[PDB]
Amino acid sequence: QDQICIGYHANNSTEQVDTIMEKNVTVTHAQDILEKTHNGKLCDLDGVKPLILRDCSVAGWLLGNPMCDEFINVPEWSYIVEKANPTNDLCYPGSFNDYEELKYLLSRINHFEKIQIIPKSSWSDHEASSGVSSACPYLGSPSFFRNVVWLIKKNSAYPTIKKSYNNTNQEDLLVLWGIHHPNDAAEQTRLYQNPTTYISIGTSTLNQRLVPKIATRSKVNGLSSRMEFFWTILKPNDAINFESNGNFIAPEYAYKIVKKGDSAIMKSELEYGNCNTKCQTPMGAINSSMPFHNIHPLTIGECPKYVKSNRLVLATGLRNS
Amino acid sequence: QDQICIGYHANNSTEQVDTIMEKNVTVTHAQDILEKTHNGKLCDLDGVKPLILRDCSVAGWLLGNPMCDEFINVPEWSYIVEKANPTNDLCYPGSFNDYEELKYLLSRINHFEKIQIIPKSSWSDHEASSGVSSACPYLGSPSFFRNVVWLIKKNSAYPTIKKSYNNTNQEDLLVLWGIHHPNDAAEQTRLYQNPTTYISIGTSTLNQRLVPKIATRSKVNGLSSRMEFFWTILKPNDAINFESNGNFIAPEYAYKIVKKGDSAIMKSELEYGNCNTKCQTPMGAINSSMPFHNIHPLTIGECPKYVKSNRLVLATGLRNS
Amino acid sequence: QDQICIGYHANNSTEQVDTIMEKNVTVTHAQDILEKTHNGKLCDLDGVKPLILRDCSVAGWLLGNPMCDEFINVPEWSYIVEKANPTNDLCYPGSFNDYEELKYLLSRINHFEKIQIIPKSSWSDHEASSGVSSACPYLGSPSFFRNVVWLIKKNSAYPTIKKSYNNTNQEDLLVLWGIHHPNDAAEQTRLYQNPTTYISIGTSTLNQRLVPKIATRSKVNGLSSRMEFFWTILKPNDAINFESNGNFIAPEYAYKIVKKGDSAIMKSELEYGNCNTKCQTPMGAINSSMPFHNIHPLTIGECPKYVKSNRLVLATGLRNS
Amino acid sequence: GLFGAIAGFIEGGWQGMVDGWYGYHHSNEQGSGYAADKESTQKAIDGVTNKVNSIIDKMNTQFEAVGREFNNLERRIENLNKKMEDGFLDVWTYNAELLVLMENERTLDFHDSNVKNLYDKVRLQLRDNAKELGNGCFEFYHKCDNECMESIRNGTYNYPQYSE
Amino acid sequence: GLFGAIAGFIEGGWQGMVDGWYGYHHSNEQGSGYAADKESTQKAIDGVTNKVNSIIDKMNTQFEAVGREFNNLERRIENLNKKMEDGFLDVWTYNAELLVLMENERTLDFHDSNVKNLYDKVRLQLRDNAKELGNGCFEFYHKCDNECMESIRNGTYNYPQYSE
Amino acid sequence: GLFGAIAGFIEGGWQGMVDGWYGYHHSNEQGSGYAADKESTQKAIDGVTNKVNSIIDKMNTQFEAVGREFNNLERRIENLNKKMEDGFLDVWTYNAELLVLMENERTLDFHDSNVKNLYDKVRLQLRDNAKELGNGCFEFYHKCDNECMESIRNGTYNYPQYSE
Ligand SMILES: *[C@@H]1O[C@H](CO)[C@@H](O)[C@H](O)[C@H]1NC(C)=O
Ligand SMILES: *[C@@H]1O[C@H](CO)[C@@H](O)[C@H](O)[C@H]1NC(C)=O
Ligand SMILES: *[C@@H]1O[C@H](CO)[C@@H](O)[C@H](O)[C@H]1NC(C)=O
């Protein structure tokens, strides 16, 4: 006789998909839309290399911890990598005012240019080279943060300082300074003669007045004293004004923000790989066309969408048996 | 012969819809559920008219900037319209404590009633009519904020002020006051004789003590001095207590909150249209029955749901060819 | 003749379901997945009993309000129940610094152990048993918070206190203390001789200095004076240092955090039932296998998912008529 | 055509039918004409009306949005605010668009179903007494006037009418 | 009836069938009775069981909610907290309700499909040897006892049984 | 098999067909072979390509995530941050997974539809001139060479070819 039949494709594929009513359905064709692989490295992001603070933190970096000299002058970065628990932070115990806000600002910056706004040589009637501690040691000798200067008395006298700086630049300035909180009145007089002191700082926007708190505290890094740091952003053509009769950790270097942009502060224990990528996560870089990944929520660059699934397979062909 | 046929409607409609598997499918009937039109005006909201601060901000309004007299007495509003960058704000440079929190409070208020809590005439042993500046000018002559009074010394003396005010009303009171931070000790004595001063303010809930910060700062509106403003909400039958020996910008007028309600603070460059609406957005009002719009997320009144789509058309009829 | 027919099940069920295109469709079988019932009681949560502050608040409890002695020593709790408006809070008017942050900490704690860190007997040169008020009465006689001690002058003298406490324990310590803000200079001298006083408190992390604010304020509980309370968490092997020449409400008892865990602070007007549960809400406990409930968003324990629906019924059988 | 009726074995639609979505075209002794099936058309009407109002009603409590302002040192929570409001905006935009895409398809294929089942409703009546042309038309072996037609279009076609 | 079987060409359901969702009713020499199709009924069971547990399992990580308190001058972030928690509450409520609305429909029409395909499974067996009544019943031209019936209801009907 | 074609009345698939998803197998005088239906296969291709790109495109503005840090006394807003980001993560994970589950099913049944409608496209051509076997095959009463076959597989089968 003669016959015609109608039928459908079948092949040797073992690619299963899931539906709402049935799991593990073997089908002919299926596309995977979920990327599950990274390279386990910290790579450049489109040619521009990350800033990898190793055992230094942002505070140690910006203030100039003597153990952080690797990052004395830092080129443009794509993103910053800090460890969960950096060992080189504030060598001299104390605190950093609005620290998290500053880190947040850093997520918006790609390049700093460190400039000298006040030379150490410009301190006529005070000692600018004796402000060092064994808690901030450099090569087994007492040092201190490099970008700020711990001013002490000269010839048993601390004359009131009035110093102003006009931001002649067109970039915004990150300006850092500090106050010293001694452990006792004896230390206060030993360091700055004057018993009762202050630091007043003013801009167009800022108007603050710090007073040292002299008190016994538990020891941290062998010290009961503390340093408290502050920062501000000087607008172009605005000036910053300092007036102090003691306890003043003057600024020396400030930071020009020459490149605003989209950046991020990653917490990763990883170190620099020598690679490039378009998408980076704390655990490694991604090379994918896939629309989804399940590697890490925190991501930088042209990336797939993070999703909590370990399997997303979309059916293209028909049922197979 | 004889025949019957079964078939379906077709018409002359060019209304396309989209599906998951096919785009631009021409069909017979389709309903549109997305509103894409506003009138480009700032309208009344159901009969009650908005408050449109023009080149004044909320701070300039509430403190009584001499250039903001248009809004000296303001009737019930539906919503407030402030520009992104109002020119008439704090004529005398300085700051407003908890400003954003106060704006937020304003999003909950529909009507203020300005009442006089302390007459200028009640300042016996101080000068109440000399506290004016060329930075807050009115008609080319030195003035000042109208709702607060800048008290200075009288006959080379500033006796300590103790003034209390019991909120005999049943509405809550917005009470504003301020402190003056001079540029130098000479100005401090020129204005208030007393070298070392303070302002203490107390209620049932509030207990603060302000001290002036005397320091050189960069000039803003020609001034290196600053004014710092504060506000509080006096409950019915609670009292506010002021004690000061200088630098005190006393309150004169306060604000009764007679109408709490749902309001909003819109940022719009637009000006008042002479219209009514049920739904307002920063770019214009909406007259729609449609369940969705794509005009602006920020909305006030009986409004459709904001959505980021430029097209949402739902099929009602069948496929057409 | 002979016949075979194909057909489907039908039964006597009145269980309706809804679809996108039709409401109230009677079907044969349907499963309900929404729990709508609680028992209206406050029950134990898997054997461990809640802490039910009745008319005491967290502040009254921790500070030791004399009217809160029911909770002088409190065993491990599953969760805490506070009323919307507790009557026994700060008997002496004033405030509690970072109160909400502390409540938040409490949502992470299941068990405190109150320990004595400074005996009242250890106050040699000050009076430790006269610091009582009629605003904090116990049994119709002036008392005060039990866990802190209001130190006053002894023999018309208030010598500067220096007291330190090393946390020898391995649990973290909640340490509470306070400052007294008098109404007038006469009260300041009546209580502490010294006109100008301070309290300085230091740890490895903390470095603060409180100064009393002397001023007239409106009366609350008959008083114009105020108490301001502070707290900190002492790490194991860290010490806390107090130095003060007046206005110091010293700590006496502190709290060991011996059991961290998942807890919650419920606002409920309800009182203890004598029951057990696996899932608790402010309005009552739940005994369900259902995946959803619509009772209350705030929940503790192994609970269904809160959802705003009053009806969720899923069809299992087929259409019925 | 998921059910193969519309743009399937039926080659297109009737401009002439203006009283419903599905209907019949007859040609007899007394003349020819069109007649929409009020039943299936009515059920369809309730189907799409209920679908429409279900989609609208399901999405009336979306996410409103109130303005909040933050100063220069509240950049983190300003960012949090911004990202959360845009977040909700995005999930709801996605919800609306997606739902439209799904129910449009289900609606079209619902019409397809209606036509196919109408055709079958007739085919099961005019068994041997008519032949299937293949275009949705039936050719009669007997003679059907406007009363045999009316009786078909209400389900009461009397097959007792011989054959051959 | 998207597939036209249930409440379509079949006028309703059999109270008498109590052993499954779909089945047969026979009437022969030896008597009459009902018998549910264990195959299609079992597959249906796995279909709705798997659907149910899929819907439950897909939505177990919803949004929990912890209480946070804010003072008089933290009104903005209190508002942010409140609006975000209500926001999630709303998107998840919408998700649950919507999903129910969709899968209910798909389930009913799945039953419709099962019945239609069962009917066809038979119709394709009893070709010329029986006539289609139109109500889901087949009238035999030959004689089928309980063994011809059993052989039908397991797919092994032997058409070799002449005609006319 | 929602439409009963694939794994329904057709017992399985043809390894031999390698040029499309649906097609024919013929056996005549000149020989036997397979031939995929370019029409339905092409429409299917556009169907799944468009579905895929629709699902991808609908979900490109998901929720990004930026790191924010909080100190020891910002525990409440740190918690708020954490819970909101995990919240969005969860709603989007749910969206992706759910959408996959739905459109996989709709896709498979779409193939089923294609096969069934192809079969019908033929069945409606070879009316009396062939008998329905029941497995998706037609047995001819006349004789069809590769030209009658080609004319079938493009819709132009000329029924005028007698019977009996
Ligand atoms: C900074 O210097 C420039 C020119 O030297 C001047 O225009 C500007 O006023 C200065 N800025 C301030 C605020 O002193
Ligand atoms: C305000 O005045 C009323 C009556 O004059 C009085 O009852 C109330 O105590 C006063 N408020 C305060 C706190 O002084
Ligand atoms: C607490 O005491 C222990 C031993 O007595 C000591 O190791 C530790 O240094 C003390 N803590 C501080 C910070 O004083």
Give me some keywords for this one.
heterohexamer, A: 321 residues, mainly beta, Hemagglutinin, Chain A, domain 2, Hemagglutinin (Ha1 Chain), Chain: A, domain 1, 2 domains, 7-stranded mixed beta sheet, 4-stranded antiparallel beta sheet, 7% helix, 38% strand, D: 164 residues, mainly alpha, Hemagglutinin Ectodomain, Chain B, two-stranded antiparallel ribbon, 4 helices, 4 strands, rod-shaped, binds 2-acetamido-2-deoxy-beta-D-glucopyranose, viral protein, virus attachment, membrane fusion, hexameric
Write the layout of secondary structure elements.
The complex is a heterohexamer, with three copies of chain A (321 residues) and three copies of chain D (164 residues).
Chain A: E1 3-8, E2 16-17, E3 25-26, E4 30-32, E5 34-35, E6 42-45, E7 51-52, H1 58-63, E8 80-82, E9 94-96, H2 99-106, E10 109-116, E11 133-138, E12 141-143, E13 148-150, E14 161-166, E15 172-181, H3 185-192, E16 199-202, E17 207-210, E18 226-234, E19 239-244, E20 248-251, E21 253-260, E22 265-267, E23 272-277, E24 279-281, E25 284-286, E26 292-293, E27 300-301, E28 305-306, E29 313-315
Parallel strand pairs in A: 5-26, 6-23, 7-8, 8-22, 9-18, 26-28
Antiparallel strand pairs in A: 2-3, 4-29, 10-21, 11-12, 13-20, 14-19, 15-18, 15-20, 15-21, 16-17, 16-19, 24-25, 24-27
Chain D: H1 5-9, E1 22-27, E2 32-36, H2 38-58, H3 75-123, E3 130-132, E4 137-140, H4 146-152
Helix pairs in contact in D: 2-3
The structure holds 2-acetamido-2-deoxy-beta-D-glucopyranose (3 copies).
One 2-acetamido-2-deoxy-beta-D-glucopyranose binds at residues 166, 168, 237-239 of chain B.
Protein name (chains D, E, F): Hemagglutinin
GO biological process, one term (chains D, E, F): clathrin-dependent endocytosis of virus by host cell
GO molecular function, one term (chains D, E, F): host cell surface receptor binding
